[PDB]
């Protein structure tokens, strides 16, 4: 029933995306970034993170990295699935992305899963080791949903990132545009 309810949720979000994120215009595209960054900010507010990095990657992928606890990976009695899988298969960003990848650094281990339109492409796997904790989410917005544009505006991202750092003092939040490898721009904000 659990995994059935997952698939139905994905279908629901992709049928009426504007009901979930306000619009499928440039505004809604940027809302994807906010949803992910908001979750990292909660982890800092909980006492466990203090650095968030947003990278606009080649072809308008977005990568958001935080140094929090890592999304948990323990198998849920609820779903029989890893917690991270449950969390990400119920995410609007994941549903509205053509592709999305997660790397969790936790338990001295790096765990990876990938998704398309919210559907896991393989079971969560151990890919490496680590001495850090945190979460990396990389996604590519689905152009079948975002029919006007899938191109981010640096100044839009910058203005809100600066506002978020000012509002949440002590969190370092960095924005980097890597879309043109010959001119990489970075702005980093850290209030008191």
CATH numbers and ranges of domains, the chain: 1-192 (3.30.565.10)
How far apart, in whole angstroms, are the C-alpha atoms of residue 140 and residue 133? 24
Residue with tokens 């982890």: 43
What 8-state DSSP symbol labels residue 180?
S
φ, ψ dihedrals at 112, nearest 5°: -135, 140
Q: How far is CA 182 from CA 54, 58, 112, 176, 177, in A?
A: 19, 12, 30, 13, 11
How far apart, in whole angstroms, are the C-alpha atoms of residue 113 and residue 88? 10
Q: Burial level of 85, CB count in 10 A (0-12/13-18/19+)?
A: buried
Measured between its terminal Cα atoms, the distance across the chain in Å is 48
Q: Are 157 and 30 in contact (CB under 8 A)?
A: yes
Q: Burial level of 64, CB count in 10 A (0-12/13-18/19+)?
A: buried
User: Method used for this model?
Assistant: X-ray
Residue with tokens 């779903």: 79
Measured from the Cβ of residue 48, the count of other Cβ atoms closer than 10 Å reads 15
C-alpha closest to that of 53 among 188, 191, 192, 184: 188
Give a three-class secondary structure readout of 12-62.
HHHHCHHHHHCCCCHHHHHHHHHHHHHHHHHHHHCCCCCEEEEEEEHHHEE
């Amino acid at each position: 029933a659990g995994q059935i309810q997952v698939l139905e949720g994905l279908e629901a979000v992709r049928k009426r995306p504007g009901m979930y994120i306000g619009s499928t215009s440039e505004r809604g595209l940027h809302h994807l970034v906010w949803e992910i960054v908001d979750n990292s900010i909660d982890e800092a507010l909980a006492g466990y993170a203090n650095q968030i990095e947003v990278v606009i990657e080649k072809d308008n992928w977005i990568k958001v990295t935080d140094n929090g606890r890592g999304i948990p990976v323990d198998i849920q009695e609820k779903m029989g699935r890893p917690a991270v899988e449950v969390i990400l298969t119920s995410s609007v960003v994941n549903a509205l992305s053509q592709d999305l990848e997660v790397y969790v650094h936790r338990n001295e281990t790096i765990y990876h899963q990938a998704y398309k339109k919210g559907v896991p492409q393989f079971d969560l796997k151990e890919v490496g080791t680590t001495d850090k904790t945190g979460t990396v989410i990389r996604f590519k917005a689905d152009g079948e949903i975002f029919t006007e544009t899938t191109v981010y505006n640096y100044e839009t991202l910058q203005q809100r990132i600066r506002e978020l750092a000012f509002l949440n003092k002590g969190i370092q939040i960095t924005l980097r545009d890597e879309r043109d490898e010959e001119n990489v721009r970075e702005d980093s904000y850290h209030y008191e």
